[PDB]
């Protein structure tokens, strides 16, 4: 356990919250600083595969999360132009038996609130309205500066300040890399959506330079919709690229089922999609970058928040194993071991994710090949998914 | 049979020769005019699938053709960059039982000479050094003009003057469509080629914007090599595009096994690859376009000469069936029925051929998809090949 340890967490997104919970459950003294004046997340969906579900179950929060979630029966890929089913990933008992938990979907806001509530219940001292301005290592302590003029001492610090991380600048001068794709979201009352057939699955329509995803939320009561498309504005050097004037044309070549979808999306805000080139070293002295600060992906594998959750489980588990006997002196080794375990995993998701999205967005003959590949696969094989859903940090 | 019939054939390539043989075997009076001063073809390879072999066997020329041919055991597709085997098409007893004959390869020159010799033996009057300048229909005869000032009367005429057909202008004003790919050939003494492992198959290396094909000829004594690549010069408007200064760079990204291949090719002559948009009507009065004059393909399905051979079998068979009772008055109906049977077949080869070549030349993620598609196919299924190799005109 981590009783005498002190950890400061910079950032209170899903990653920071998950880390607060994991560490506080091990008995650590956790202090978390979040810049925003309230904890919160977007009231739209995310997908959590069993690689995340199993961890939430270990922390004792999965039953509760599931009480407000949706359990899809399959992931269904469809051609965005013909609406033809290409393949399905079955999420039933064989799947859940293999991977140790369910694939579920839920509101980001709910998942976040649940983690925050559990972290507080486990003893984590959470602070909103507080920006971490600097982290340095002096001797065997991390010294953390905040925007009220104060400094704070801890054994380690977690840089969990997201894609646009300023703490990352301590380790890397790299900048976010534009995908040239923009994402729009929407949630609609289920019944309020015009559907030919009912939706009980995650449905992804994949087409030339675009995709469109639908899944239910909150026990079937709401439908989440997500449109991602290649922005003409980006390649022309627009700074505020991917705006909603681009949507109609981006989907004009698609099936009516996809086109009808566009009307339900929120249009007042959107998410231009950036990632970063993978980096091997996430550690500066007694600071480690985790979550999006370390490994921000494009969302095709729907695993960014899951990675941050996995980061929390690995850090907590590895620290509790080593700190118990080695104490505070052991932290730099612990952070090195966590980085060594996490970097190859996460970096593969970053790189493979890029290719996966590319595979979704193919056109012409390449699309014809892609479609046939999907249709004719061995659906009993797990070779495409075991590396993702079957991973564990347990040693 | 066709005893009282007179047919004039404009053009003496593989198609004209095959038509001369088929018609003369039915007892027709055949006169063929070839522009060149000698009959001849390029002394390089072609591939003849069982859709052609079965027809040659019917004409009694297959045993003889095979005595100078090579019988490959498989068609092997390899990645041009890694040299990895992707898939094989087995050409063994199951294949030959399904499709009614062998897939073989041979010299174009030999195949052509064999057809010409058989046509002469069957009674066809062949003329070299004679250009057909015009064909018109007057009453119930085709009137054929030649470049010595003479005119000739026949019941029908075949326009078999190839890709650059001037007789086609009677029916269509279309022009050849550039693929932007150029083809080089070579034949080398087998032993004279530097091979890591021996070649007993048709081997096709498929890569980004290029491919490279190898197969033995003449019982294993020679190796045929064919390089096809996308020409940078074509897109820049060079008139004489695809020249050999482009070869080294076109293959620079490929495996050594492919790169070594380039050195064996003839460099003093090359074949820029053009086809034509498919057309439905090939008939003008008592003239029918056949062979490349009607349906010139890009050579990815290796079926252009085979199509011309199929044209000969269908024309001869359908005419012999109908002329016997209807006589000369029946020819326009016969030509219509041949066109009706042949156009959908041949036009599918033209169009599918284009996509097939595109599938060979993919790059990036599309290549990754294509490779996996090929590797994971049901190799017992014939769904990709039955439409091609299992076709027959027999009614
Ligand atoms: C499972 C759905 C269908 C995916 C089918 C095609 C995917 C990729 C084809 C191209 C990649 C070929 C890779 C060949 C080697 C291979 O299988 O590696 C395997 C690793 O494969 C990979 O590493 C494949 C990477 C592709 C990702 C699959 C994605 C899983 C689905 C994510 C769903 C997210 C939410 C969806 C929202 C709509 C290991 O092969 P080995 O076991 O033989 O060694
Ligand atoms: C046989 C080698 C591997 C070819 C594998 C992938 C080819 C194409 C994938 C894309 C096309 C998907 C078509 C799906 C529908 C289909 O199967 O149609 C089928 C028709 O498929 C087609 O019409 C496929 C067209 C692709 C051509 C296959 C080429 C045969 C090999 C030629 C070799 C030439 C010489 C090589 C020199 C190196 C009918 O399907 P149904 O029976 O279910 O109806
Ligand atoms: C369109 C889209 C769809 C997605 N869908 C999925 C999905 O289905 N499943 C999945 O697993 N992932 C998904 N992701 C990825 C996921 O949203 C992220 O990987 C994840 O939320 C990152 O969490 P984080 O806590 O590391 O960073 P963030 O969410 O960015 O949180 C960082 C926090 O730190 C705060 N902050 C910044 N600087 C400071 C500072 N200096 N001091 C204090 N606080 C600071 C911020 O206010 C913020 O709250 C998706 C992403 C996108 C863009
Ligand atoms: C690089 C390449 C590889 C190929 N590989 C294969 C393969 O493996 N298998 C396959 O089946 N096919 C293959 N083909 C296709 C094949 O070569 C052709 O489809 C086929 O030869 C066409 O035969 P044809 O008799 O219709 O026309 P052509 O071969 O063009 O013959 C037309 C003839 O008419 C003559 N002529 C022109 N005008 C007149 C006139 N006005 N009067 C008299 N004579 C005239 C010409 O001199 C010529 O001899 C390939 C083609 C290329 C370019
Ligand atoms: Cl993601
Ligand atoms: Cl992801
Ligand atoms: Cl051809
Ligand atoms: Cl062809």
């Amino acid at each position: 356990n981590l009783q005498d340890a002190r950890i400061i967490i910079a950032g209170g997104g899903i990653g920071g919250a998950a880390n607060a919970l994991a560490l506080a459950q091990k008995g650590a003294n956790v202090t978390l600083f979040e810049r925003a004046s309230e904890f919160g997340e977007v009231g739209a969906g995310l997908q959590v595969g069993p690689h995340g579900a199993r961890i939430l179950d270990s922390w004792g929060v999965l039953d509760d999360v599931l009480s407000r979630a949706f359990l899809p029966k399959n992931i269904v890929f469809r051609d965005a132009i013909t609406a033809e089913v290409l393949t399905k990933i079955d999420l039933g008992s064989e799947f859940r038996g293999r991977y140790g938990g369910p694939f579920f979907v839920t509101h980001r806001s709910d998942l976040h609130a649940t983690l925050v509530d559990a972290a507080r219940a486990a003893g984590a001292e959470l602070h909103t309205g507080v920006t971490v301005t600097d982290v340095i290592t002096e001797g065997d302590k991390a010294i953390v500066s905040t925007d009220d003029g104060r400094t704070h001492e801890a054994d380690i610090a977690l840089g969990m300040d997201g894609l646009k991380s300023r703490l990352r600048e301590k380790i890397s001068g790299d900048e976010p890399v534009s995908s040239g794709y923009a994402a729009y979201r929407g949630t609609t009352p289920y019944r309020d959506v015009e559907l030919d057939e009912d939706i009980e699955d995650v449905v992804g329509y994949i087409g030339p330079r675009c995709h469109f995803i639908q899944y239910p939320l909150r026990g079937g009561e709401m439908l989440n919709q997500v449109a991602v498309f290649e922005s003409p504005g980006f390649k022309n050097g627009i700074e505020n690229w991917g705006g909603p004037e681009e949507l109609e044309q981006a989907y004009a070549h698609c099936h009516e089922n996809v086109r009808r979808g566009i009307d339900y999306l929120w249009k007042d805000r959107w998410w231009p999609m950036y990632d970063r080139e993978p980096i091997e070293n996430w550690v500066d002295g007694r600071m480690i970058l985790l979550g999006d600060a370390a490994h921000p992906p494009l969302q095709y594998l729907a695993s960014g928040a899951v990675m941050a959750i996995e980061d929390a489980k690995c850090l907590a588990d590895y620290a509790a194993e080593d700190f118990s006997t080695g104490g505070n002196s052991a932290w730099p080794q612990i952070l090195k071991e966590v980085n060594t375990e996490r970097a190859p995993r996460c970096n593969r998701i970053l790189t493979t994710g890029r290719m996966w999205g590319e595979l979704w967005h193919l056109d012409g003959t390449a699309r014809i090949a892609r479609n046939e590949l999907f249709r004719t696969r061995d659906t009993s094989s797990y070779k495409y998914t075991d590396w993702l859903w079957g991973y564990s940090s347990d040693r």
Side-chain angles (χ1 to χ4, degrees), chain A residues 219-251:
Chain A
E221 287 276 289
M222 296 285 112
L223 194 75
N224 197 71
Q225 296 181 106
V226 182
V228 169
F229 68 91
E230 187 175 59
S231 176
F234 171 74
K235 308 162 193 271
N236 303 326
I238 297 185
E239 301 100 300
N240 185 30
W241 59 269
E245 70 276 2
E246 289 180 349
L247 282 162
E248 190 155 281
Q249 179 68 35
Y251 292 93

mmCIF file of all heavy atoms in Angstrom, chain A residues 219-251:
data_model
loop_
_atom_site.group_PDB
_atom_site.id
_atom_site.type_symbol
_atom_site.label_atom_id
_atom_site.label_comp_id
_atom_site.label_asym_id
_atom_site.label_seq_id
_atom_site.Cartn_x
_atom_site.Cartn_y
_atom_site.Cartn_z
ATOM 1 N N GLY A 219 -29.708 3.327 -21.093
ATOM 2 C CA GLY A 219 -30.694 2.271 -21.221
ATOM 3 C C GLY A 219 -31.595 2.329 -22.448
ATOM 4 O O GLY A 219 -32.697 1.875 -22.381
ATOM 5 N N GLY A 220 -31.182 2.967 -23.528
ATOM 6 C CA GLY A 220 -31.989 3.020 -24.725
ATOM 7 C C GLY A 220 -32.801 4.279 -24.858
ATOM 8 O O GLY A 220 -33.440 4.489 -25.859
ATOM 9 N N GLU A 221 -32.740 5.148 -23.854
ATOM 10 C CA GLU A 221 -33.530 6.357 -23.875
ATOM 11 C C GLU A 221 -33.002 7.503 -24.725
ATOM 12 O O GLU A 221 -33.807 8.363 -25.120
ATOM 13 C CB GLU A 221 -33.835 6.829 -22.435
ATOM 14 C CG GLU A 221 -34.874 5.950 -21.723
ATOM 15 C CD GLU A 221 -36.350 6.325 -22.023
ATOM 16 O OE1 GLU A 221 -36.865 7.404 -21.559
ATOM 17 O OE2 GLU A 221 -37.050 5.540 -22.683
ATOM 18 N N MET A 222 -31.691 7.557 -24.997
ATOM 19 C CA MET A 222 -31.123 8.588 -25.880
ATOM 20 C C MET A 222 -30.310 7.915 -26.998
ATOM 21 O O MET A 222 -29.961 6.749 -26.817
ATOM 22 C CB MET A 222 -30.181 9.472 -25.089
ATOM 23 C CG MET A 222 -30.848 10.286 -23.984
ATOM 24 S SD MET A 222 -31.749 11.640 -24.736
ATOM 25 C CE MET A 222 -33.447 11.154 -24.376
ATOM 26 N N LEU A 223 -30.126 8.595 -28.135
ATOM 27 C CA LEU A 223 -29.210 8.141 -29.185
ATOM 28 C C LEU A 223 -28.099 9.091 -29.333
ATOM 29 O O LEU A 223 -28.347 10.292 -29.526
ATOM 30 C CB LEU A 223 -29.870 8.141 -30.540
ATOM 31 C CG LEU A 223 -29.128 7.389 -31.628
ATOM 32 C CD1 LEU A 223 -29.255 5.877 -31.460
ATOM 33 C CD2 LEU A 223 -29.636 7.746 -33.011
ATOM 34 N N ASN A 224 -26.873 8.546 -29.277
ATOM 35 C CA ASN A 224 -25.645 9.339 -29.508
ATOM 36 C C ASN A 224 -25.310 9.263 -30.976
ATOM 37 O O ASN A 224 -25.359 8.165 -31.550
ATOM 38 C CB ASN A 224 -24.467 8.762 -28.738
ATOM 39 C CG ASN A 224 -23.309 9.736 -28.600
ATOM 40 O OD1 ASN A 224 -23.388 10.720 -27.880
ATOM 41 N ND2 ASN A 224 -22.236 9.431 -29.233
ATOM 42 N N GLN A 225 -24.961 10.387 -31.587
ATOM 43 C CA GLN A 225 -24.546 10.419 -33.004
ATOM 44 C C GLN A 225 -23.272 11.228 -33.170
ATOM 45 O O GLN A 225 -23.085 12.290 -32.515
ATOM 46 C CB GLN A 225 -25.652 10.921 -33.930
ATOM 47 C CG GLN A 225 -26.884 9.998 -33.973
ATOM 48 C CD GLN A 225 -28.041 10.410 -34.903
ATOM 49 O OE1 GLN A 225 -28.254 9.805 -35.983
ATOM 50 N NE2 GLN A 225 -28.878 11.386 -34.433
ATOM 51 N N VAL A 226 -22.369 10.713 -34.035
ATOM 52 C CA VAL A 226 -21.022 11.285 -34.210
ATOM 53 C C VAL A 226 -20.678 11.260 -35.701
ATOM 54 O O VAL A 226 -20.759 10.219 -36.371
ATOM 55 C CB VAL A 226 -19.975 10.478 -33.447
ATOM 56 C CG1 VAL A 226 -18.583 11.074 -33.566
ATOM 57 C CG2 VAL A 226 -20.296 10.519 -31.958
ATOM 58 N N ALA A 227 -20.297 12.422 -36.227
ATOM 59 C CA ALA A 227 -19.966 12.560 -37.610
ATOM 60 C C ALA A 227 -18.531 13.067 -37.670
ATOM 61 O O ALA A 227 -18.193 14.066 -37.011
ATOM 62 C CB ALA A 227 -20.941 13.576 -38.219
ATOM 63 N N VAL A 228 -17.692 12.377 -38.424
ATOM 64 C CA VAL A 228 -16.340 12.741 -38.614
ATOM 65 C C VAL A 228 -16.038 12.811 -40.105
ATOM 66 O O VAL A 228 -16.270 11.846 -40.817
ATOM 67 C CB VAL A 228 -15.407 11.692 -37.984
ATOM 68 C CG1 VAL A 228 -13.940 11.872 -38.373
ATOM 69 C CG2 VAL A 228 -15.516 11.723 -36.448
ATOM 70 N N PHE A 229 -15.439 13.902 -40.558
ATOM 71 C CA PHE A 229 -15.253 14.095 -41.969
ATOM 72 C C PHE A 229 -13.979 14.840 -42.251
ATOM 73 O O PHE A 229 -13.439 15.572 -41.410
ATOM 74 C CB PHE A 229 -16.450 14.803 -42.584
ATOM 75 C CG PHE A 229 -16.583 16.228 -42.114
ATOM 76 C CD1 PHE A 229 -16.010 17.256 -42.782
ATOM 77 C CD2 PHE A 229 -17.252 16.485 -40.973
ATOM 78 C CE1 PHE A 229 -16.106 18.543 -42.285
ATOM 79 C CE2 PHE A 229 -17.310 17.726 -40.426
ATOM 80 C CZ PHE A 229 -16.730 18.769 -41.089
ATOM 81 N N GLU A 230 -13.442 14.645 -43.445
ATOM 82 C CA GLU A 230 -12.272 15.331 -43.866
ATOM 83 C C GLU A 230 -12.621 16.815 -44.237
ATOM 84 O O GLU A 230 -13.432 17.031 -45.134
ATOM 85 C CB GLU A 230 -11.640 14.676 -45.109
ATOM 86 C CG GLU A 230 -10.292 15.276 -45.487
ATOM 87 C CD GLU A 230 -9.612 14.546 -46.648
ATOM 88 O OE1 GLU A 230 -10.212 14.481 -47.716
ATOM 89 O OE2 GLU A 230 -8.428 14.188 -46.502
ATOM 90 N N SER A 231 -11.963 17.765 -43.612
ATOM 91 C CA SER A 231 -12.222 19.210 -43.812
ATOM 92 C C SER A 231 -11.446 19.783 -44.960
ATOM 93 O O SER A 231 -10.254 19.868 -44.867
ATOM 94 C CB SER A 231 -11.828 20.005 -42.549
ATOM 95 O OG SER A 231 -11.970 21.404 -42.735
ATOM 96 N N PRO A 232 -12.127 20.235 -46.017
ATOM 97 C CA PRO A 232 -11.514 20.984 -47.125
ATOM 98 C C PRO A 232 -10.835 22.220 -46.585
ATOM 99 O O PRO A 232 -9.724 22.593 -47.052
ATOM 100 C CB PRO A 232 -12.702 21.349 -48.033
ATOM 101 C CG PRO A 232 -13.742 20.389 -47.675
ATOM 102 C CD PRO A 232 -13.576 20.064 -46.211
ATOM 103 N N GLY A 233 -11.473 22.863 -45.577
ATOM 104 C CA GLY A 233 -10.854 24.085 -45.002
ATOM 105 C C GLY A 233 -9.467 23.889 -44.424
ATOM 106 O O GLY A 233 -8.581 24.730 -44.539
ATOM 107 N N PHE A 234 -9.236 22.719 -43.834
ATOM 108 C CA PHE A 234 -7.909 22.483 -43.247
ATOM 109 C C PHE A 234 -6.787 22.555 -44.279
ATOM 110 O O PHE A 234 -5.761 23.115 -44.027
ATOM 111 C CB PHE A 234 -7.816 21.143 -42.446
ATOM 112 C CG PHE A 234 -6.411 20.823 -42.057
ATOM 113 C CD1 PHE A 234 -5.815 21.547 -41.045
ATOM 114 C CD2 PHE A 234 -5.653 19.886 -42.749
ATOM 115 C CE1 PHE A 234 -4.517 21.272 -40.695
ATOM 116 C CE2 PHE A 234 -4.354 19.630 -42.436
ATOM 117 C CZ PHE A 234 -3.788 20.318 -41.415
ATOM 118 N N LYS A 235 -6.993 21.992 -45.444
ATOM 119 C CA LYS A 235 -5.917 21.907 -46.413
ATOM 120 C C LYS A 235 -5.686 23.287 -47.035
ATOM 121 O O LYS A 235 -4.576 23.574 -47.449
ATOM 122 C CB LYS A 235 -6.247 20.951 -47.519
ATOM 123 C CG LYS A 235 -6.687 19.574 -47.092
ATOM 124 C CD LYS A 235 -7.387 18.994 -48.312
ATOM 125 C CE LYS A 235 -8.174 17.747 -47.969
ATOM 126 N NZ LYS A 235 -7.207 16.634 -48.129
ATOM 127 N N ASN A 236 -6.690 24.151 -46.984
ATOM 128 C CA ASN A 236 -6.534 25.538 -47.409
ATOM 129 C C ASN A 236 -6.020 26.500 -46.337
ATOM 130 O O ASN A 236 -5.961 27.712 -46.562
ATOM 131 C CB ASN A 236 -7.864 26.059 -47.901
ATOM 132 C CG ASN A 236 -8.416 25.231 -49.019
ATOM 133 O OD1 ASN A 236 -7.655 24.720 -49.824
ATOM 134 N ND2 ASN A 236 -9.727 25.025 -49.039
ATOM 135 N N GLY A 237 -5.679 26.012 -45.151
ATOM 136 C CA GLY A 237 -5.011 26.877 -44.170
ATOM 137 C C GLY A 237 -5.923 27.722 -43.310
ATOM 138 O O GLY A 237 -5.483 28.707 -42.724
ATOM 139 N N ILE A 238 -7.196 27.376 -43.277
ATOM 140 C CA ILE A 238 -8.136 28.008 -42.355
ATOM 141 C C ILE A 238 -7.674 27.682 -40.919
ATOM 142 O O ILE A 238 -7.261 26.539 -40.614
ATOM 143 C CB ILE A 238 -9.562 27.507 -42.610
ATOM 144 C CG1 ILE A 238 -10.027 27.893 -44.037
ATOM 145 C CG2 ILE A 238 -10.502 27.996 -41.529
ATOM 146 C CD1 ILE A 238 -11.487 27.556 -44.395
ATOM 147 N N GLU A 239 -7.688 28.692 -40.051
ATOM 148 C CA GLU A 239 -7.248 28.498 -38.681
ATOM 149 C C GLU A 239 -8.364 27.863 -37.928
ATOM 150 O O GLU A 239 -8.123 26.847 -37.287
ATOM 151 C CB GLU A 239 -6.835 29.809 -37.981
ATOM 152 C CG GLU A 239 -5.689 30.581 -38.687
ATOM 153 C CD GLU A 239 -6.204 31.758 -39.557
ATOM 154 O OE1 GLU A 239 -7.007 31.463 -40.529
ATOM 155 O OE2 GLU A 239 -5.831 32.954 -39.220
ATOM 156 N N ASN A 240 -9.601 28.353 -38.090
ATOM 157 C CA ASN A 240 -10.733 27.772 -37.376
ATOM 158 C C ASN A 240 -11.471 26.718 -38.227
ATOM 159 O O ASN A 240 -12.654 26.845 -38.540
ATOM 160 C CB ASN A 240 -11.663 28.901 -36.945
ATOM 161 C CG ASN A 240 -12.815 28.425 -36.075
ATOM 162 O OD1 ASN A 240 -12.700 27.432 -35.333
ATOM 163 N ND2 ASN A 240 -13.956 29.148 -36.153
ATOM 164 N N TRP A 241 -10.736 25.701 -38.645
ATOM 165 C CA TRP A 241 -11.230 24.781 -39.678
ATOM 166 C C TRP A 241 -12.237 23.769 -39.150
ATOM 167 O O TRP A 241 -12.249 23.500 -37.962
ATOM 168 C CB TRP A 241 -10.007 24.088 -40.350
ATOM 169 C CG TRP A 241 -9.083 23.291 -39.473
ATOM 170 C CD1 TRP A 241 -7.959 23.705 -38.815
ATOM 171 C CD2 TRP A 241 -9.240 21.925 -39.159
ATOM 172 N NE1 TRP A 241 -7.392 22.688 -38.105
ATOM 173 C CE2 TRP A 241 -8.162 21.564 -38.281
ATOM 174 C CE3 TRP A 241 -10.159 20.969 -39.538
ATOM 175 C CZ2 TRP A 241 -8.002 20.289 -37.810
ATOM 176 C CZ3 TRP A 241 -10.005 19.702 -39.078
ATOM 177 C CH2 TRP A 241 -8.942 19.363 -38.199
ATOM 178 N N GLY A 242 -13.062 23.209 -40.047
ATOM 179 C CA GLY A 242 -13.950 22.095 -39.765
ATOM 180 C C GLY A 242 -15.337 22.555 -39.380
ATOM 181 O O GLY A 242 -16.085 21.821 -38.808
ATOM 182 N N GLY A 243 -15.641 23.821 -39.658
ATOM 183 C CA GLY A 243 -16.937 24.368 -39.283
ATOM 184 C C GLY A 243 -18.149 23.813 -40.001
ATOM 185 O O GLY A 243 -18.016 23.111 -40.973
ATOM 186 N N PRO A 244 -19.348 24.153 -39.498
ATOM 187 C CA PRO A 244 -20.486 23.300 -39.860
ATOM 188 C C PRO A 244 -20.983 23.585 -41.243
ATOM 189 O O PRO A 244 -21.833 22.875 -41.709
ATOM 190 C CB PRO A 244 -21.573 23.702 -38.835
ATOM 191 C CG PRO A 244 -21.172 25.062 -38.416
ATOM 192 C CD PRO A 244 -19.673 25.028 -38.371
ATOM 193 N N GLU A 245 -20.503 24.648 -41.869
ATOM 194 C CA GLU A 245 -20.814 24.904 -43.275
ATOM 195 C C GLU A 245 -20.266 23.816 -44.158
ATOM 196 O O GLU A 245 -20.703 23.698 -45.280
ATOM 197 C CB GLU A 245 -20.302 26.282 -43.736
ATOM 198 C CG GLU A 245 -18.796 26.439 -43.858
ATOM 199 C CD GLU A 245 -18.102 26.796 -42.543
ATOM 200 O OE1 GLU A 245 -18.755 26.895 -41.460
ATOM 201 O OE2 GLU A 245 -16.854 26.940 -42.610
ATOM 202 N N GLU A 246 -19.317 23.038 -43.647
ATOM 203 C CA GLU A 246 -18.703 21.937 -44.406
ATOM 204 C C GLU A 246 -19.515 20.628 -44.358
ATOM 205 O O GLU A 246 -19.281 19.764 -45.182
ATOM 206 C CB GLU A 246 -17.249 21.655 -43.941
ATOM 207 C CG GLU A 246 -16.260 22.753 -44.354
ATOM 208 C CD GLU A 246 -14.781 22.545 -43.938
ATOM 209 O OE1 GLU A 246 -14.531 21.656 -43.142
ATOM 210 O OE2 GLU A 246 -13.882 23.282 -44.452
ATOM 211 N N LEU A 247 -20.413 20.475 -43.395
ATOM 212 C CA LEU A 247 -21.071 19.173 -43.165
ATOM 213 C C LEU A 247 -21.901 18.655 -44.323
ATOM 214 O O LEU A 247 -21.681 17.514 -44.805
ATOM 215 C CB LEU A 247 -21.974 19.279 -41.966
ATOM 216 C CG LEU A 247 -21.257 19.215 -40.654
ATOM 217 C CD1 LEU A 247 -22.226 19.772 -39.666
ATOM 218 C CD2 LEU A 247 -20.934 17.753 -40.302
ATOM 219 N N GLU A 248 -22.851 19.470 -44.814
ATOM 220 C CA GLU A 248 -23.721 18.991 -45.869
ATOM 221 C C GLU A 248 -22.950 18.371 -47.072
ATOM 222 O O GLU A 248 -23.179 17.202 -47.468
ATOM 223 C CB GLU A 248 -24.588 20.119 -46.339
ATOM 224 C CG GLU A 248 -25.689 19.712 -47.267
ATOM 225 C CD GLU A 248 -26.821 20.711 -47.183
ATOM 226 O OE1 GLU A 248 -27.603 20.609 -46.201
ATOM 227 O OE2 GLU A 248 -26.905 21.625 -48.044
ATOM 228 N N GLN A 249 -22.017 19.132 -47.631
ATOM 229 C CA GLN A 249 -21.175 18.637 -48.717
ATOM 230 C C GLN A 249 -20.316 17.433 -48.351
ATOM 231 O O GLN A 249 -20.102 16.565 -49.201
ATOM 232 C CB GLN A 249 -20.259 19.734 -49.188
ATOM 233 C CG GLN A 249 -19.295 19.362 -50.295
ATOM 234 C CD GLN A 249 -20.005 19.077 -51.615
ATOM 235 O OE1 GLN A 249 -20.999 19.691 -51.931
ATOM 236 N NE2 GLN A 249 -19.504 18.117 -52.363
ATOM 237 N N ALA A 250 -19.749 17.421 -47.122
ATOM 238 C CA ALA A 250 -18.941 16.264 -46.676
ATOM 239 C C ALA A 250 -19.718 14.921 -46.724
ATOM 240 O O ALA A 250 -19.086 13.879 -46.845
ATOM 241 C CB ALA A 250 -18.348 16.500 -45.266
ATOM 242 N N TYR A 251 -21.053 14.969 -46.613
ATOM 243 C CA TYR A 251 -21.860 13.739 -46.607
ATOM 244 C C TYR A 251 -22.743 13.549 -47.806
ATOM 245 O O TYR A 251 -23.593 12.625 -47.836
ATOM 246 C CB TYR A 251 -22.669 13.639 -45.322
ATOM 247 C CG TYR A 251 -21.780 13.411 -44.150
ATOM 248 C CD1 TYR A 251 -21.313 14.476 -43.407
ATOM 249 C CD2 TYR A 251 -21.323 12.118 -43.830
ATOM 250 C CE1 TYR A 251 -20.441 14.267 -42.360
ATOM 251 C CE2 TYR A 251 -20.518 11.887 -42.761
ATOM 252 C CZ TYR A 251 -20.022 12.972 -42.053
ATOM 253 O OH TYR A 251 -19.154 12.764 -40.958
#
